[PDB]
Design an enzyme around this catalytic site. Sequence first.
Site, PDB file in Angstrom:
ATOM      1  N   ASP A  19     -68.039  33.019 -45.942  1.00  0.00           N
ATOM      2  CA  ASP A  19     -66.871  33.875 -46.181  1.00  0.00           C
ATOM      3  C   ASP A  19     -66.148  33.569 -47.493  1.00  0.00           C
ATOM      4  O   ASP A  19     -65.937  32.404 -47.801  1.00  0.00           O
ATOM      5  CB  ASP A  19     -65.894  33.620 -45.028  1.00  0.00           C
ATOM      6  CG  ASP A  19     -64.885  34.696 -44.771  1.00  0.00           C
ATOM      7  OD1 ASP A  19     -64.032  34.942 -45.659  1.00  0.00           O
ATOM      8  OD2 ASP A  19     -64.920  35.276 -43.680  1.00  0.00           O
ATOM      9  N   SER A  77     -64.050  39.193 -47.055  1.00  0.00           N
ATOM     10  CA  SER A  77     -64.373  39.314 -45.632  1.00  0.00           C
ATOM     11  C   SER A  77     -64.276  40.778 -45.172  1.00  0.00           C
ATOM     12  O   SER A  77     -64.940  41.595 -45.797  1.00  0.00           O
ATOM     13  CB  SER A  77     -63.515  38.365 -44.809  1.00  0.00           C
ATOM     14  OG  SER A  77     -63.936  38.380 -43.455  1.00  0.00           O
TER      15      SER A  77
END
Length: 357
Positions: free
Chosen positions: A191, A53
Site C-alpha cells: 500500500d 490505496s
Amino acid sequence: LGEMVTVLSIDGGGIRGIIPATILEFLEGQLQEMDNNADARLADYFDVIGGTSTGGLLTAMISTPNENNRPFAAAKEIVPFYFEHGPQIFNPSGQILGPKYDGKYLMQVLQEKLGETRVHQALTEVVISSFDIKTNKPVIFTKSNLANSPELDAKMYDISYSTAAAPTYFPPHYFVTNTSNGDEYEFNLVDGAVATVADPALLSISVATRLAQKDPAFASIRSLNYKKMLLLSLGTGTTSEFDKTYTAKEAATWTAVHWMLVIQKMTDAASSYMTDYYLSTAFQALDSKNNYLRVQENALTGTTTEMDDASEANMELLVQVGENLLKKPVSEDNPETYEEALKRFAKLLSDRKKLRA
C-alpha cells in the site's frame, strides 16, 4: 485562469473511499450541469489525478480509457462499485496465517474492470503510490518518468491492487514488466500508505512541479508559483473522539499484535494532518489559500472508523457522512460550506477548460 494547473488528490482509507467518491459524484454532476454535457468527466478538467490505496483505485477507474478513449468510470459509478464489490473485497479469508483478506477478489474485480490497460494510456497524468519491500523504496506510478524509465509502464490492475495492498489486510503484490533492453523488472509492493502518502496531495503537486520543468502545459507553476495552481484534496476522514482513541497508560503493556492493529490508522491520520499543514503553509505564503480546497471529515464515529467494514449498514453510514460533509463549513469562523466551495471549484475548472478551447 487559462494558464492554471489543476490537480485532484484522493486519500486512502479502505471502504471510507465512499466519502471522497460521494464528493466527486457531486463535483462531476456540477461540471456536467454547468457545461451542458452529461458525458463530462473529472479527467477532462484535471491535469493531474493522484490517489493512494482506494483513492488510487478511484484514480485508476476515472483516468483509464474505455474502447471510445473516454474515462472507464463516471464519478456516480464509484459508490455503486463499493456497495457491489466492497463486501467481497473485504470478505475475511479465515486463514490461520497471513493477512485478514486473501486479495483474490480485489485482484479479480480490478482485472475485470481495467482489462489489459497500462499507465501510458491514462487520459490524464496519474500519481499512484506504493512501497517496494524488496528495493525498500516508494514506487510512484505516473505517465511522466516513463520516458527515462519504461519498466514503470505497468498494468493498471497491478498498480491498483498494489496501491491498496495494506500490510496485515492483503498480501503484498508481485509482478514483472520489461526494461529498454528487454530484461525483466520486478515489483514487490505494498500500500502507498506505507510510503507515508496516505494523503498524496503534496506528492501530486510535486509531480506537477517536476512536469513544469519539461512540459509547456505546466509552465505557469515553473518556479513554485502555486498562485497558478488549483488543488482539490479529498480525505476519507479521521477521528479525535476519546471513545476511539488511546491513553499512554493503557498502551504501556501493548504487545506487537495490538500495535500492528492501530499503527497504520495513526500514521494515516498523521499523513492527513502533516500533508495539509505543508500545503496550507505553502498556499498561505503566496496569499493563495483558496486555490487549495481540502475536503475532510474530522469527527468519524461508530462503525465508520473501520476501513474494512463493508457491511450494508456501514456503507450507508459512509454515504451519509459524505452527503453531510457537503453541508459542513470549510473551516471554523467561515460559514462557506464544502458544497459551495466545490461549486466555486467546478466553475474554475469549467472556465479554464473553455479558455483552453
